[PDB]
Design a protein around this ligand. Structure first.
Ligand SMILES: *[C@@H]1O[C@H](CO)[C@@H](O[C@@H]2O[C@H](CO)[C@@H](O)[C@H](O)[C@H]2NC(C)=O)[C@H](O)[C@H]1NC(C)=O
Ligand SMILES: *[C@@H]1O[C@H](CO)[C@@H](O[C@@H]2O[C@H](CO)[C@@H](O)[C@H](O)[C@H]2NC(C)=O)[C@H](O)[C@H]1NC(C)=O
Ligand SMILES: *[C@@H]1O[C@H](CO)[C@@H](O[C@@H]2O[C@H](CO)[C@@H](O)[C@H](O)[C@H]2NC(C)=O)[C@H](O)[C@H]1NC(C)=O
Ligand SMILES: *[C@@H]1O[C@H](CO)[C@@H](O[C@@H]2O[C@H](CO)[C@@H](O)[C@H](O)[C@H]2NC(C)=O)[C@H](O)[C@H]1NC(C)=O
Ligand SMILES: *[C@@H]1O[C@H](CO)[C@@H](O)[C@H](O)[C@H]1NC(C)=O
Ligand SMILES: *[C@@H]1O[C@H](CO)[C@@H](O)[C@H](O)[C@H]1NC(C)=O
Ligand SMILES: [Cl-]
Ligand SMILES: [Cu+2]
Ligand SMILES: [Cu+2]
Ligand SMILES: [Cu+2]
Ligand SMILES: [Cu+2]
Ligand SMILES: [Xe]
Ligand SMILES: [Xe]
Ligand SMILES: [Xe]
Length: 559
């Protein structure tokens, strides 16, 4: 908990801890634990926020999102998850939480654990808050989170700018009336649909019926407000802007950055930005707009103008009256202009593309179903009843090809990775690439061009080394893989474990778009505590015993 964190000095946190402390190697010892229970249930014919009745939802504690997790830098977070769905297993991934030597609590069913069985299955996750900022959690059971199994994480800590009010979490998500599993089946043979609506902080207005409500945020005039924006969608990538206001970014994902004032922001799926907003405009009501760019290549909604209201306290009630100005087209790309407060530096003056450091993404339209995604020649397909961790605990090293294991034995070294976006395929799409267990450095990407321009780019050392940035590049957990192009990433092998790396569009990871970095398997087997081993076995026991009774087939990757 904080001892010197105030509106005038958000840079300070407590004795020996501030915005400049390297939070990757230094953690406050609070001795405090925050507890939550997530009770999952399945509801049919559920009337949602915009009036529309949905066939089926799967909810945490009977709400549209689960608990808002709130703790301090250095606390422990402990969550009991109880699966009262009918047929589905479940696993909760803590997106943005590195799980430093807690790989078994990562929530990747088929990798770190088996799914928690239905009809009362239970498991407790426990992790340390070694990073402060805005994150989120969600099911990793195929596309299950598309049904409602999702919520926010707020870990308090220092910030790179002074601010007066913390408005809290502000999750933005696409919203589909059809259920996740039908959408998985749909996207296996059909391009993904636009979203029926966009929920902002849990609420939206129906574009046809006018039912539902606008998110309504009250700003205190003259004050600096921290707003924690998240994109918790399954596919939609968002552009956001506040009419007649700027936003000053103070963090990207769970990494604080030097303050950057912008008129608008692109958020890929899974991305977060903490911003500061100054209520220094005439007291009034202002639209907060969700827009799309990129020639629909990274999403869209059937609601043409999803919005929230920003209301100055003391202003009249009612709807904003200035519809404002369309933001610049972000071309399905996040900004590489952010600079982490705590710096990292690495050499970018030489690189050789090789099979062992290249991950070629490929759309295969030649099998069944129609749309199958492959990485390095293979579509991922995990075994819920036999996670990689079971191999580790059993000394078995013959992993199925379908597990897309990329084994990395280097101890605490920087590793570089070239991701190629189907430069020779029929067509290519932007993908939000997400890495479990670490933040990566974004050293660079193919030239920024319009998202649907069909331009194809292969890494060329001769011209591309010069475009790389090794001097405190963007560091975060999610970044865009340009359509038709490439992305050059780097992470340090400081955390033994099995760590998924995949596109975060539910339909694409469903259809195979992922690898699994097996980081220091040898060190891993040694760091698994007896309590994690026993509990891993207990849960796998119960799943394996349940699965032969499940009425439904596994129809996708499992992720
Ligand atoms: C998870 O539970 C859902 C909800 O019942 C299942 O989704 C159904 O799946 C079947 C078989 O593919 C479809 O015919 C239905 O249309 C789906 N219903 C809905 C509302 O999506 C899904 O099969 C379950 N997954 C597993 C492996 O148990
Ligand atoms: C997001 O929505 C939540 C849920 O409605 C809001 O939480 C409420 O905040 C108001 C104003 O402080 C309180 O009167 C309620 O008691 C809160 N409800 C709960 C359950 O927390 C939250 O304010 C919204 N976020 C933003 C940024 O406006
Ligand atoms: C959003 O919330 C604010 C805060 O409650 C509402 O502002 C009030 O609006 C009424 C008239 O509707 C005024 O009489 C009050 O003086 C306002 N309170 C404050 C603190 O300014 C506002 O109505 C809400 N906006 C909408 C459209 O629902
Ligand atoms: C921000 O969102 C608002 C509210 O959805 C948009 O306002 C609508 O603008 C359209 C386009 O001309 C009008 O036809 C509607 O009547 C407006 N609706 C309301 C409720 O007033 C606004 O256009 C959006 N601005 C941007 C820049 O996207
Ligand atoms: C889960 O929630 C249900 C429905 O509200 C409740 O009846 C049940 O007791 C809960 N189970 C547990 C173990 O919390
Ligand atoms: C991709 O597969 C090739 C075999 O064709 C292998 O040599 C290479 O190491 C693989 N790359 C990665 C990072 O898995
Ligand atoms: Cl993660
Ligand atoms: Cu995620
Ligand atoms: Cu994740
Ligand atoms: Cu993708
Ligand atoms: Cu994941
Ligand atoms: Xe590099
Ligand atoms: Xe990576
Ligand atoms: Xe990948």
């Amino acid at each position: 908990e904080p001892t010197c964190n105030t509106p005038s000095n958000r840079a300070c946190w407590s004795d020996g801890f501030d915005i400049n402390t390297d939070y990757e190697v230094s953690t406050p010892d609070t001795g405090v634990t925050q507890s939550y229970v997530f009770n999952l249930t399945e509801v049919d014919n559920w009337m949602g926020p915009d009036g529309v009745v949905k066939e089926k939802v799967m909810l945490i504690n009977g709400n549209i999102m689960g608990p808002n997790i709130v703790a301090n830098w250095g606390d422990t977070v402990e969550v009991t998850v109880i699966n009262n769905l009918v047929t589905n297993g479940t696993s909760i991934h803590w997106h943005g939480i590195h799980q430093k030597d807690t790989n078994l609590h990562d929530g990747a069913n088929g990798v770190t654990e088996c799914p928690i069985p239905p009809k009362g299955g239970q498991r407790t996750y426990r992790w340390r808050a070694r990073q402060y900022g805005t994150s989120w959690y969600h099911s990793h059971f195929s596309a299950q989170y598309g049904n409602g199994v999702v919520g926010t994480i707020q870990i308090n800590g220092p910030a790179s700018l002074p601010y007066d009010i913390d408005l809290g979490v502000f999750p933005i998500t696409d919203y589909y009336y059809r259920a996740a599993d039908d959408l998985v089946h749909f996207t296996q043979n059909n391009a993904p649909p636009f979203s029926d609506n966009v929920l902002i902080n849990g609420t939206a207005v129906n574009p046809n019926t006018g039912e539902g409500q606008y998110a309504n945020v009250t700003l205190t005039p003259g004050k600096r407000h921290r707003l924690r924006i998240l994109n918790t969608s399954t596919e939609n990538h968002f552009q956001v802007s506040l009419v007649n206001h700027t936003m000053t970014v103070i963090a990207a994902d769970m990494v604080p950055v030097n303050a950057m004032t912008v008129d608008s922001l692109f958020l890929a799926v899974g991305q977060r930005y903490d911003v500061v907003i100054d209520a220094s405009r005439a007291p009034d009501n202002y639209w907060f707009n969700v827009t799309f760019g990129g020639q629909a290549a990274c999403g869209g909604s059937l609601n043409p103008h999803p919005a929230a209201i920003f209301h100055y306290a003391g202003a009249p009630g009612g709807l904003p009256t200035d519809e404002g100005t369309p933001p610049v087209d972000h071309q399905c790309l996040d900004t590489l202009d952010v600079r982490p407060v705590v710096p990292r530096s690495v050499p970018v003056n030489s690189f050789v593309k090789r099979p062992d450091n290249t991950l070629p993404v490929a759309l295969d339209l030649t099998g069944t179903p129609l749309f199958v995604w492959k990485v390095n020649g293979s579509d991922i397909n995990v075994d819920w009843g036999k996670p990689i961790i079971d191999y580790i605990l059993t000394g078995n090293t013959s992993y199925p090809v379908s597990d897309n294991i990329v084994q990395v034995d280097a101890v605490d070294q920087w590793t570089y990775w070239l991701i190629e976006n189907d430069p020779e395929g029929p067509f290519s799409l932007p993908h939000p690439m997400h890495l479990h267990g670490h933040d990566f450095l974004v050293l660079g990407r193919s030239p920024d061009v319009p998202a649907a321009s069909q331009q194809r780019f292969v890494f060329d050392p001769a011209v591309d080394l010069a475009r790389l940035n090794g001097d405190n590049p963007p560091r975060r957990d999610t970044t865009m893989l340009p359509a038709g192009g490439w992305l050059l990433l780097a992470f340090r092998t400081d955390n033994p474990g099995a760590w998924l790396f995949h596109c975060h569009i539910a339909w694409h990871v469903s259809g195979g778009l992922s690898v699994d970095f097996l980081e220091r398997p040898a060190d891993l087997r040694q760091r698994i505590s007896q309590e994690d081993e026993d509990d891993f076995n207990r849960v796998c026991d119960e799943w394996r015993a349940y699965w032969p009774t499940n009425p439904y087939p596994k129809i996708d990757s499992g992720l």
